[PDB]
Amino acid sequence: YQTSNFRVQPTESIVRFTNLCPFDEVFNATRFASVYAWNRKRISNCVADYSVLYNFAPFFAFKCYGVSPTKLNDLCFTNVYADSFVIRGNEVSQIAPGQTGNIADYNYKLPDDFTGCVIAWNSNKLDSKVGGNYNYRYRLFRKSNLKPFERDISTEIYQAGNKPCNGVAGVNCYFPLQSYGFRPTYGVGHQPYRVVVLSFELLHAPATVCGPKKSTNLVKNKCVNFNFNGLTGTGVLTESNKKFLPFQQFGRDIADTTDAVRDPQTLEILDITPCSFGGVSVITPGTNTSNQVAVLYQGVNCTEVPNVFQTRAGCLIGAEYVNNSYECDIPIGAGICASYQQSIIAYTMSLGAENSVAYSNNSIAIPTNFTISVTTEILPVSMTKTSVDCTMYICGDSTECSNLL
Amino acid sequence: DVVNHNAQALNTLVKQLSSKFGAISSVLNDILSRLDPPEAEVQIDRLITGRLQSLQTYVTQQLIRAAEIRASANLAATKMSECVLGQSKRVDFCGKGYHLMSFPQSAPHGVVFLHVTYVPAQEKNFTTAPAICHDGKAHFPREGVFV
Amino acid sequence: LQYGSFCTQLKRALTGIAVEQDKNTQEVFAQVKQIYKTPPIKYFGGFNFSQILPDPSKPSKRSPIEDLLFNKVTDLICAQKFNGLTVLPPLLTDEMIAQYTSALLAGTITSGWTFGAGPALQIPFPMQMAYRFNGIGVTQNVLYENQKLIANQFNSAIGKIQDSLSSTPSALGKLQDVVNHNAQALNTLVKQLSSKFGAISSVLNDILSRLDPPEAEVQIDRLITGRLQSLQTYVTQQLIRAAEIRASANLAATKMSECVLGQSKRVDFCGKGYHLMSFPQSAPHGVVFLHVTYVPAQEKNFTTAPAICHDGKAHFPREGVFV
Amino acid sequence: DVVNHNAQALNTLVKQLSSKFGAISSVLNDILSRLDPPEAEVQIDRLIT
Amino acid sequence: YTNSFTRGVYYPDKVFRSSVLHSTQDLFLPFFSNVTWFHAPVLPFNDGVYFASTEKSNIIRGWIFGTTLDSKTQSLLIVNNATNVVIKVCEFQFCNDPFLMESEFRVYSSANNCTFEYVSQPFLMKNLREFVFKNIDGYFKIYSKHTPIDLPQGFSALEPLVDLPIGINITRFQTLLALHRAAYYVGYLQPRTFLLKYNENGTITDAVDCALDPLSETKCTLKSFTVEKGI
Ligand SMILES: *[C@@H]1O[C@H](CO)[C@@H](O)[C@H](O)[C@H]1NC(C)=O
Ligand SMILES: *[C@@H]1O[C@H](CO)[C@@H](O)[C@H](O)[C@H]1NC(C)=O
Ligand SMILES: *[C@@H]1O[C@H](CO)[C@@H](O)[C@H](O)[C@H]1NC(C)=O
Ligand SMILES: *[C@@H]1O[C@H](CO)[C@@H](O)[C@H](O)[C@H]1NC(C)=O
Ligand SMILES: *[C@@H]1O[C@H](CO)[C@@H](O)[C@H](O)[C@H]1NC(C)=O
Ligand SMILES: *[C@@H]1O[C@H](CO)[C@@H](O)[C@H](O)[C@H]1NC(C)=O
């Protein structure tokens, strides 16, 4: 009988991965650009911690979509972007992937498949002028919808009617760029907020921006968890003779499974192989006859398991091989059978008794008597006839789900 | 084996009703009470899809098994026509040996054939020849063999 | 765990198929009680069987034709192994099957059709061939008076078979198609693991290490559903294909019983023409029959009559025809 | 019936295209218009399945 | 005018593969294409550019990529001075016919803030120099290859050289040598689906277009380079 599987377990952990990466100058910026013209800064080639910037705690809303905020320090990213501006708290809901909004459609479009985090903190005291700060201005109208991740600077006169103006403005011609009403009297939602979004990628390029983790020494020939630059996995790590070209980092078989990797610290190539595993079968005579058993580890070398006999089917434990030959009793495989004789034995099955016929040029054999024999033969002819009520089975007695059905 | 297979299939179908299929509960009334009508629909639809899938697999397996049973029944009808209503010359079709006759018996969901055959025994050695030369002519046996 | 008992049903279906495969081979080859051996001196009245009898020199103990067949019919395995797919060895090895076929050949050469109904009774081979000539409606003296010509024709016809197989490479298409179909199904199964099915990624580790559990669960569900669908489809196709192979194996067993262990009167069951005898050979995952038949030739025209009138009485031919 | 069993089967196939399958509508264009791109995806996935 | 037989093939990704047929979709130079054998005027930059040349003594130096090539709009410049690769991206005002002991060197009309000034080992140096330039995803990617030997009829893939995260818009480009009107070809890229053969090592021995002709489409569908008789 086939019962379960056996799997080797890892015994260790291997990790592989410098200058600090500054965010304070990005966050603690003296001035922030307008919504219609939003500042963008590229972050790369520097290791950064997301907890130090989580220590200031000015935030009012943290929204990470692709990732979870708690695991941010654990992930290695490439091509980090930071888009920054100032907007009052009224329009914070308008910034989300696939979210309808006036600035979303006309000032800054966020793709619905966004991968990153959006945060905003209220620096009302610093960014709200008591006499009115009209420097921050947003576009109100344009002929067409804005594309995702596009910045528009050209602010021409917008024609709002049949009346052709051409710099005349007036009725049916309003200039899109318009300034906020920055009153300290204005309450929550009309006070300034410094909003920055952080955009990342996952696994299209070799890692550049890694988090705050510490590397360890590497091991070989042992099944061990490994975390090469954020590439998690488990297996035995071996030396590799693959002819990796200097731009090449991983390898892959016909099944698109990673077959090699390069250490971030030492430039060398390593092969990967999952540790051994397989199926387990239990060979037993009847329970009433005895309680001894034998165990078969299918397709496994006997050297890789914690009487031991090696067979083309696997490793057999608990049975003693013999040189005799009988008819098959319990088939193990590859011509090997097993039987019970106050012990459990394994042997090579025998095809039958051997016989040689006395062929000759002029010899014949004739019967001198006969036998009448009777034999049985059993054949099934029919099956059970069943029927089912579809609705009663699926839905039972609820009429709500019947309509759904 | 036929009875065991059918009973196993029916039992599996019945037991599949108590699986939640990734919903909060398997009991319909619990979803009806614990939730508002607008929300209940998704949870209900999960159960609908799961139970419909299980029914489909049951029916497909039954079709395959029925085709196997039909093949067996056609073989049985051929044996009835050729071993019982006649005498066969096909080797090993009706028992082992030289076929003489057969007798049918009925059994639950099937049939049993009793084949009556002839078997030689107690052989002996002899010297043989293909033909006999006599009076300058070659003689061949009409139906037997020279010993 | 709370998605049903589908895993148990899939495992049980595959086990049933695997057991049926060994039963198929047992039905075809294990049709003989004893292991018969050929006499040391290989003289059978001028007929030469060297091309189908076992070759002592080769270590495999296979006949030349069987060697040609085995050579004719022919890492991706590691990738399949590393994802929970395994291939089990068959119960009967190739040597056992070759030994079974050699036993059948020895029995039919030295005993005629007798060993298939009781004890094996010996008879000279030309005398057996005269019995088989009587079987199709020709008298014995036709064989005994043309023994050398018939033996030469048989030897030449056997000689041409090896070339006919060796030259044409499309002869063994059926056996190759079985292997290709199986390998294609396994390859599709293993390649299906790289589909997103609507999730953010197709790697479980990334989804786990990137999201909180409440948001990871919804992503896990999609992958589970897609992969379960793939497994179900694979098992259904295997069930249908096994249902086909079983019919083929039943036909092969019937042909072994009726063409090799006896002489058949069914038209076109054992070759084209009037059946005389047949010989089996083993091939990877299959069997090959060689059918020996009688074909008339060089006909002539005659005038005939239904009866002959003599002394006011009508005479009819006892077993022939008037010409 | 060998003819009939085929001509029937195709018919049911071509009728399943008019079934909503638990979506708002069975017409792709009608769903594409009346709904936002983020929302349309679940409806389309229902139809596809 | 002349014909590009089988040229413009490069490695699409930085991963190892061996003894495998792999199918990709990417910008490529379609097989047996019309390419312009300039023997000397702005040249458009549509989706990418395939440049090839056989000149010796480094007559050609670099290229100029820009949307409008004005001091108001950012542009690009690359110079190979037999010592290092001077890449720059600053708003320049260009001469009408720019070019380069000639102790004095030409100066462009104006300069502005230089956003990126990567410098490295020079590119250049009977032989052919092939370069593929593409600008997508806010990245400017450059491939290259130098082969000893007229475009020869053979196969030689191009290895990636550099990627620049400049993230600007380019529409037009020109070359940097004395253009008082030196032989160099120009071709263009289009979206295509290719089938590439990787040998035992990482090299790309052969490839196949998927839309050249019906036979190629059959080779794609069967995923092999040979087809038996059939339909
Ligand atoms: C594995 O099994 C083979 C025989 O199948 C044996 O020769 C070998 O020593 C075993 N161990 C290793 C590490 O190969
Ligand atoms: C049968 O006859 C042949 C030729 O006459 C001879 O070679 C062979 O040995 C004979 N068989 C015996 C004597 O068993
Ligand atoms: C016929 O003779 C042979 C010669 O050895 C002998 O082996 C065989 O047993 C004999 N047959 C019978 C039925 O005794
Ligand atoms: C028999 O005669 C017919 C007509 O004379 C002729 O066509 C046919 O070929 C003849 N048969 C043979 C075998 O010669
Ligand atoms: C390439 O294009 C030019 C102009 O369009 C044309 O004259 C020439 O024949 C073309 N080359 C071909 C078709 O090989
Ligand atoms: C591939 O690398 C091996 C390494 O020894 C070499 O022998 C072989 O010639 C190479 N094949 C090429 C470069 O085509």
mmCIF file with all atom_site columns, C-alpha atoms in Angstrom, chain A residues 258-353:
data_model
loop_
_atom_site.group_PDB
_atom_site.id
_atom_site.type_symbol
_atom_site.label_atom_id
_atom_site.label_alt_id
_atom_site.label_comp_id
_atom_site.label_asym_id
_atom_site.label_entity_id
_atom_site.label_seq_id
_atom_site.pdbx_PDB_ins_code
_atom_site.Cartn_x
_atom_site.Cartn_y
_atom_site.Cartn_z
_atom_site.occupancy
_atom_site.B_iso_or_equiv
_atom_site.pdbx_formal_charge
_atom_site.auth_seq_id
_atom_site.auth_comp_id
_atom_site.auth_asym_id
_atom_site.auth_atom_id
_atom_site.pdbx_PDB_model_num
ATOM 1  C CA . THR A 1 258 ? 16.147 28.448  -11.769 1.00 0.00 ? 258 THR A CA 1
ATOM 2  C CA . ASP A 1 259 ? 19.267 26.327  -12.223 1.00 0.00 ? 259 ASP A CA 1
ATOM 3  C CA . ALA A 1 260 ? 22.088 28.674  -11.181 1.00 0.00 ? 260 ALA A CA 1
ATOM 4  C CA . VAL A 1 261 ? 22.790 31.954  -9.411  1.00 0.00 ? 261 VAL A CA 1
ATOM 5  C CA . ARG A 1 262 ? 25.632 34.403  -8.771  1.00 0.00 ? 262 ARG A CA 1
ATOM 6  C CA . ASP A 1 263 ? 26.578 35.466  -5.257  1.00 0.00 ? 263 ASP A CA 1
ATOM 7  C CA . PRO A 1 264 ? 26.074 39.217  -4.684  1.00 0.00 ? 264 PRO A CA 1
ATOM 8  C CA . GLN A 1 265 ? 29.325 39.430  -2.701  1.00 0.00 ? 265 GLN A CA 1
ATOM 9  C CA . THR A 1 266 ? 31.616 37.032  -4.569  1.00 0.00 ? 266 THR A CA 1
ATOM 10 C CA . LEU A 1 267 ? 31.288 36.901  -8.345  1.00 0.00 ? 267 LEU A CA 1
ATOM 11 C CA . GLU A 1 268 ? 30.916 33.164  -8.865  1.00 0.00 ? 268 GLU A CA 1
ATOM 12 C CA . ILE A 1 269 ? 28.271 30.825  -10.239 1.00 0.00 ? 269 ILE A CA 1
ATOM 13 C CA . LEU A 1 270 ? 26.463 28.172  -8.189  1.00 0.00 ? 270 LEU A CA 1
ATOM 14 C CA . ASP A 1 271 ? 24.146 25.340  -9.195  1.00 0.00 ? 271 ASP A CA 1
ATOM 15 C CA . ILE A 1 272 ? 20.958 24.515  -7.288  1.00 0.00 ? 272 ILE A CA 1
ATOM 16 C CA . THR A 1 273 ? 19.317 21.157  -6.683  1.00 0.00 ? 273 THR A CA 1
ATOM 17 C CA . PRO A 1 274 ? 16.334 20.357  -4.428  1.00 0.00 ? 274 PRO A CA 1
ATOM 18 C CA . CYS A 1 275 ? 17.070 17.824  -1.732  1.00 0.00 ? 275 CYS A CA 1
ATOM 19 C CA . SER A 1 276 ? 15.854 14.259  -2.086  1.00 0.00 ? 276 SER A CA 1
ATOM 20 C CA . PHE A 1 277 ? 12.241 13.177  -1.652  1.00 0.00 ? 277 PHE A CA 1
ATOM 21 C CA . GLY A 1 278 ? 9.944  10.405  -2.752  1.00 0.00 ? 278 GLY A CA 1
ATOM 22 C CA . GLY A 1 279 ? 7.055  8.087   -2.083  1.00 0.00 ? 279 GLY A CA 1
ATOM 23 C CA . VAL A 1 280 ? 6.766  5.421   0.594   1.00 0.00 ? 280 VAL A CA 1
ATOM 24 C CA . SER A 1 281 ? 5.059  2.032   0.376   1.00 0.00 ? 281 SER A CA 1
ATOM 25 C CA . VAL A 1 282 ? 4.370  -0.507  3.119   1.00 0.00 ? 282 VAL A CA 1
ATOM 26 C CA . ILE A 1 283 ? 4.557  -4.237  2.372   1.00 0.00 ? 283 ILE A CA 1
ATOM 27 C CA . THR A 1 284 ? 2.653  -6.464  4.763   1.00 0.00 ? 284 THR A CA 1
ATOM 28 C CA . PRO A 1 285 ? 1.203  -9.957  4.910   1.00 0.00 ? 285 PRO A CA 1
ATOM 29 C CA . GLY A 1 286 ? -2.275 -10.230 6.387   1.00 0.00 ? 286 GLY A CA 1
ATOM 30 C CA . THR A 1 287 ? -2.876 -8.603  9.746   1.00 0.00 ? 287 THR A CA 1
ATOM 31 C CA . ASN A 1 288 ? -4.166 -11.920 11.077  1.00 0.00 ? 288 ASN A CA 1
ATOM 32 C CA . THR A 1 289 ? -1.016 -13.749 9.959   1.00 0.00 ? 289 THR A CA 1
ATOM 33 C CA . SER A 1 290 ? 1.528  -11.421 11.581  1.00 0.00 ? 290 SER A CA 1
ATOM 34 C CA . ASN A 1 291 ? 2.382  -7.800  12.350  1.00 0.00 ? 291 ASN A CA 1
ATOM 35 C CA . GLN A 1 292 ? 5.784  -7.422  10.691  1.00 0.00 ? 292 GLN A CA 1
ATOM 36 C CA . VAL A 1 293 ? 6.229  -5.099  7.719   1.00 0.00 ? 293 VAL A CA 1
ATOM 37 C CA . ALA A 1 294 ? 8.764  -3.978  5.147   1.00 0.00 ? 294 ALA A CA 1
ATOM 38 C CA . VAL A 1 295 ? 9.145  -0.475  3.738   1.00 0.00 ? 295 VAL A CA 1
ATOM 39 C CA . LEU A 1 296 ? 9.956  0.667   0.206   1.00 0.00 ? 296 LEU A CA 1
ATOM 40 C CA . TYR A 1 297 ? 11.383 4.109   -0.593  1.00 0.00 ? 297 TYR A CA 1
ATOM 41 C CA . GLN A 1 298 ? 10.545 4.510   -4.260  1.00 0.00 ? 298 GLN A CA 1
ATOM 42 C CA . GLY A 1 299 ? 13.284 5.701   -6.599  1.00 0.00 ? 299 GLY A CA 1
ATOM 43 C CA . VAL A 1 300 ? 15.770 6.588   -3.855  1.00 0.00 ? 300 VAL A CA 1
ATOM 44 C CA . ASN A 1 301 ? 19.398 5.612   -3.405  1.00 0.00 ? 301 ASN A CA 1
ATOM 45 C CA . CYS A 1 302 ? 19.844 3.680   -0.171  1.00 0.00 ? 302 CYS A CA 1
ATOM 46 C CA . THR A 1 303 ? 22.609 6.093   0.868   1.00 0.00 ? 303 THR A CA 1
ATOM 47 C CA . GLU A 1 304 ? 20.050 8.888   1.389   1.00 0.00 ? 304 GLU A CA 1
ATOM 48 C CA . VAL A 1 305 ? 17.858 7.411   4.137   1.00 0.00 ? 305 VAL A CA 1
ATOM 49 C CA . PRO A 1 306 ? 18.339 7.878   7.948   1.00 0.00 ? 306 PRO A CA 1
ATOM 50 C CA . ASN A 1 307 ? 18.452 -5.332  6.342   1.00 0.00 ? 307 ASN A CA 1
ATOM 51 C CA . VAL A 1 308 ? 18.900 -2.832  3.522   1.00 0.00 ? 308 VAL A CA 1
ATOM 52 C CA . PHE A 1 309 ? 18.523 -3.952  -0.084  1.00 0.00 ? 309 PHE A CA 1
ATOM 53 C CA . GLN A 1 310 ? 18.877 -1.868  -3.234  1.00 0.00 ? 310 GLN A CA 1
ATOM 54 C CA . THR A 1 311 ? 16.455 -2.429  -6.106  1.00 0.00 ? 311 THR A CA 1
ATOM 55 C CA . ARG A 1 312 ? 15.780 -0.743  -9.422  1.00 0.00 ? 312 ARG A CA 1
ATOM 56 C CA . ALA A 1 313 ? 12.475 0.301   -7.829  1.00 0.00 ? 313 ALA A CA 1
ATOM 57 C CA . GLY A 1 314 ? 14.068 1.867   -4.747  1.00 0.00 ? 314 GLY A CA 1
ATOM 58 C CA . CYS A 1 315 ? 15.444 1.121   -1.311  1.00 0.00 ? 315 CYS A CA 1
ATOM 59 C CA . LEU A 1 316 ? 13.881 -1.827  0.527   1.00 0.00 ? 316 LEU A CA 1
ATOM 60 C CA . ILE A 1 317 ? 14.133 -2.103  4.315   1.00 0.00 ? 317 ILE A CA 1
ATOM 61 C CA . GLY A 1 318 ? 12.987 -4.985  6.486   1.00 0.00 ? 318 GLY A CA 1
ATOM 62 C CA . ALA A 1 319 ? 13.282 -7.868  4.017   1.00 0.00 ? 319 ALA A CA 1
ATOM 63 C CA . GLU A 1 320 ? 16.119 -10.305 3.366   1.00 0.00 ? 320 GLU A CA 1
ATOM 64 C CA . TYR A 1 321 ? 17.111 -11.139 -0.198  1.00 0.00 ? 321 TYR A CA 1
ATOM 65 C CA . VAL A 1 322 ? 17.408 -14.809 -1.157  1.00 0.00 ? 322 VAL A CA 1
ATOM 66 C CA . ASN A 1 323 ? 18.812 -16.702 -4.129  1.00 0.00 ? 323 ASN A CA 1
ATOM 67 C CA . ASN A 1 324 ? 15.785 -18.965 -4.605  1.00 0.00 ? 324 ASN A CA 1
ATOM 68 C CA . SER A 1 325 ? 12.971 -18.433 -7.091  1.00 0.00 ? 325 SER A CA 1
ATOM 69 C CA . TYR A 1 326 ? 9.223  -18.835 -6.662  1.00 0.00 ? 326 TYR A CA 1
ATOM 70 C CA . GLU A 1 327 ? 6.052  -17.601 -8.222  1.00 0.00 ? 327 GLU A CA 1
ATOM 71 C CA . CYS A 1 328 ? 5.148  -14.015 -7.407  1.00 0.00 ? 328 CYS A CA 1
ATOM 72 C CA . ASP A 1 329 ? 3.198  -13.377 -4.211  1.00 0.00 ? 329 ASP A CA 1
ATOM 73 C CA . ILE A 1 330 ? 3.467  -9.617  -3.597  1.00 0.00 ? 330 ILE A CA 1
ATOM 74 C CA . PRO A 1 331 ? 4.876  -7.686  -6.590  1.00 0.00 ? 331 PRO A CA 1
ATOM 75 C CA . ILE A 1 332 ? 7.547  -5.141  -5.718  1.00 0.00 ? 332 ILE A CA 1
ATOM 76 C CA . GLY A 1 333 ? 8.651  -4.411  -9.273  1.00 0.00 ? 333 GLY A CA 1
ATOM 77 C CA . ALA A 1 334 ? 11.401 -4.849  -11.858 1.00 0.00 ? 334 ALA A CA 1
ATOM 78 C CA . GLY A 1 335 ? 11.101 -8.611  -11.506 1.00 0.00 ? 335 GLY A CA 1
ATOM 79 C CA . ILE A 1 336 ? 11.287 -8.585  -7.694  1.00 0.00 ? 336 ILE A CA 1
ATOM 80 C CA . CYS A 1 337 ? 8.525  -10.028 -5.517  1.00 0.00 ? 337 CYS A CA 1
ATOM 81 C CA . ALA A 1 338 ? 8.134  -10.446 -1.765  1.00 0.00 ? 338 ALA A CA 1
ATOM 82 C CA . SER A 1 339 ? 6.664  -13.116 0.476   1.00 0.00 ? 339 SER A CA 1
ATOM 83 C CA . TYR A 1 340 ? 6.379  -14.373 4.050   1.00 0.00 ? 340 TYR A CA 1
ATOM 84 C CA . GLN A 1 341 ? 8.365  -17.486 4.951   1.00 0.00 ? 341 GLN A CA 1
ATOM 85 C CA . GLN A 1 342 ? 8.339  -16.424 10.165  1.00 0.00 ? 342 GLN A CA 1
ATOM 86 C CA . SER A 1 343 ? 10.102 -13.699 8.181   1.00 0.00 ? 343 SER A CA 1
ATOM 87 C CA . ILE A 1 344 ? 9.709  -11.486 5.117   1.00 0.00 ? 344 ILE A CA 1
ATOM 88 C CA . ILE A 1 345 ? 11.846 -12.299 2.078   1.00 0.00 ? 345 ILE A CA 1
ATOM 89 C CA . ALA A 1 346 ? 12.418 -10.828 -1.368  1.00 0.00 ? 346 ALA A CA 1
ATOM 90 C CA . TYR A 1 347 ? 13.287 -12.818 -4.466  1.00 0.00 ? 347 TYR A CA 1
ATOM 91 C CA . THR A 1 348 ? 13.231 -12.862 -8.255  1.00 0.00 ? 348 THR A CA 1
ATOM 92 C CA . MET A 1 349 ? 10.023 -14.354 -9.614  1.00 0.00 ? 349 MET A CA 1
ATOM 93 C CA . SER A 1 350 ? 10.175 -17.501 -11.736 1.00 0.00 ? 350 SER A CA 1
ATOM 94 C CA . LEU A 1 351 ? 8.346  -17.763 -15.042 1.00 0.00 ? 351 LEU A CA 1
ATOM 95 C CA . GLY A 1 352 ? 7.614  -21.470 -14.706 1.00 0.00 ? 352 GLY A CA 1
ATOM 96 C CA . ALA A 1 353 ? 8.909  -25.003 -14.713 1.00 0.00 ? 353 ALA A CA 1
#
